[PDB]
């Protein structure tokens, strides 16, 4: 089916340039245009521009000078580049495809790329167990602490465990580093037969950790 | 640019009820408006195009109407899974623009939280910092009070809270409260207590541990 998959999230320094690659499948860049939209705290959903089937580009007015979109049809890749970022350019950026080749009803979206504009340094998280110690239901979790920038992904048992999972929104500590926890409730009777692992991946630091969580 | 004003900012209803979203344009845009849904960590999902036309894969409870300046997205009978943000988009005039979104919240019966407390791992203590976590699981409504006490001393300013969005199946919230101490401080004390106040509890619930056991 139609898909768009973007490159990973991460850090851009103040005044530097932003690069994202959108790889598509299930259709050909020669028959469809690819649009770029961002979503930011101060401006919400914002349309940035488009590259059309035959190579032409349109850019929304406040971006005509710092934005460039190119592509490689044979590799099914679209290249987004934007210059001189300031902190209010921090946003989630999406590539998107319309239903019809010429139009703007956006039926297909990339998964998004969170871009943080900051002078600070990348830092991977430490992962600490929230160990189970109530109606035969026990609660356990992982503490994902002191990373930057957002985001981090958490899952349980390589995707096989989803039921009863709560992954909390990250909160920013006074240190400027983020933290979050991910919890899950399971039958206490399975603590002796099942293994519980939180798979943690912090892409901007290429820190990727599996943490086994056991009663202590 | 066309300015799109969506109203109200938040909508709250119960499952099975009907709900409508308003999107008003600063000048006529014909029927050239599209609607989108957005869930937690998701990309926008196209719901309706050209004010009223169906989208493949979109449940039939979603419809839209309007023309000129005044547009309406409607859900005739709300499902718990409709918890999301909703946006409109115009494309009668270049460049295409979006409205600021309406939040959809669901009402349900009161559910008291299940409360759990987690001491800091011996692993974390090696770094010189202690995190104590208190979990309030699957409650409604959102409003909850978490009070931290260390050896009967009220803790203030050294905890942070995080709340999930409403669950797409049971419409509850879960909340984590994290108390952060220096390791030196954590070792100087013994009794660590999280006390939870909530509409669904007939009196506050305390979960505590003694450092060590």
């Amino acid at each position: 089916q139609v898909q768009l998959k973007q490159s990973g999230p991460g850090l851009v320094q103040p005044s530097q340039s932003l690069s994202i690659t959108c790889t598509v499948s299930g259709f050909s860049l020669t028959n469809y245009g690819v649009h770029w939209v961002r979503q930011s705290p101060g401006k919400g959903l914002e349309w940035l521009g488009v590259i059309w089937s035959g190579g032409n580009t349109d850019y929304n007015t406040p971006f005509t000078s710092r934005l460039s979109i190119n592509k490689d049809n044979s590799k099914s890749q679209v290249f987004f580049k934007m210059n001189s970022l300031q902190s209010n350019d921090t946003a989630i950026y999406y590539c998107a495809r319309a239903l019809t080749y010429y139009d703007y009803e956006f039926a297909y979206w990339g998964q998004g790329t969170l871009v943080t504009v900051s002078a600070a340094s990348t830092k991977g998280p430490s992962v600490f167990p929230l160990a189970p110690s109530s109606g035969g239901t026990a609660a356990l979790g992982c503490l994902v602490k002191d990373y930057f920038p957002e985001p981090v992904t958490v899952s349980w048992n390589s995707g096989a465990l989803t039921s009863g999972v709560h992954t909390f929104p990250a909160v920013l500590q006074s240190s400027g580093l983020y933290s979050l926890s991910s919890v899950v409730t399971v039958p206490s009777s399975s603590l002796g037969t099942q293994t519980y692992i939180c798979n943690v991946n912090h892409k901007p630091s290429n820190t990727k950790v599996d943490k086994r969580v056991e009663p202590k | 640019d066309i300015l799109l004003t969506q109203s109200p900012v938040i909508l709250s209803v119960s499952p099975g009820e009907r709900v409508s979203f308003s999107c008003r344009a600063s000048q006529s845009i014909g029927t050239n408006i599209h609607w989108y849904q957005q869930r937690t960590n998701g990309s926008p999902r196209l719901l309706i195009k050209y004010a009223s036309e169906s989208i493949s894969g979109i449940p039939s409870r979603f419809s839209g109407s309007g023309s000129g300046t005044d547009f309406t997205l409607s859900i005739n009978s709300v499902e718990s899974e409709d918890i999301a943000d909703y946006y409109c988009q115009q494309n009668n005039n270049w460049p295409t623009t979006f409205g600021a979104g309406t939040k959809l919240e669901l009402k349900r019966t009161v559910a008291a939280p299940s409360v759990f407390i987690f001491p800091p791992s011996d692993e974390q203590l090696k770094s010189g910092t202690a995190s104590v976590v208190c979990l309030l699981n699957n409650f409604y409504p959102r409003e909850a009070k978490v009070q931290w006490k260390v050896d009967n001393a009220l803790q203030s300013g050294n905890s942070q809270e995080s709340v999930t969005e409403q669950d797409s199946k049971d419409s509850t919230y879960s909340l984590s409260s994290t108390l952060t101490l220096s390791k030196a401080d954590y070792e100087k004390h013994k009794v660590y207590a999280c006390e939870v106040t909530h509409q669904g509890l007939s009196s506050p619930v305390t979960k505590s541990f003694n450092r060590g056991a």
Binding site: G42, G112, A170 | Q38, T40, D85, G101
Partner: peptide, 12 residues
């Protein structure tokens, strides 16, 4: 009423 980068949800 503000988009939150953490959650991708509107918040105030």
């Amino acid at each position: 009423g503000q988009f939150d980068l953490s959650t991708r949800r509107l918040k105030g």
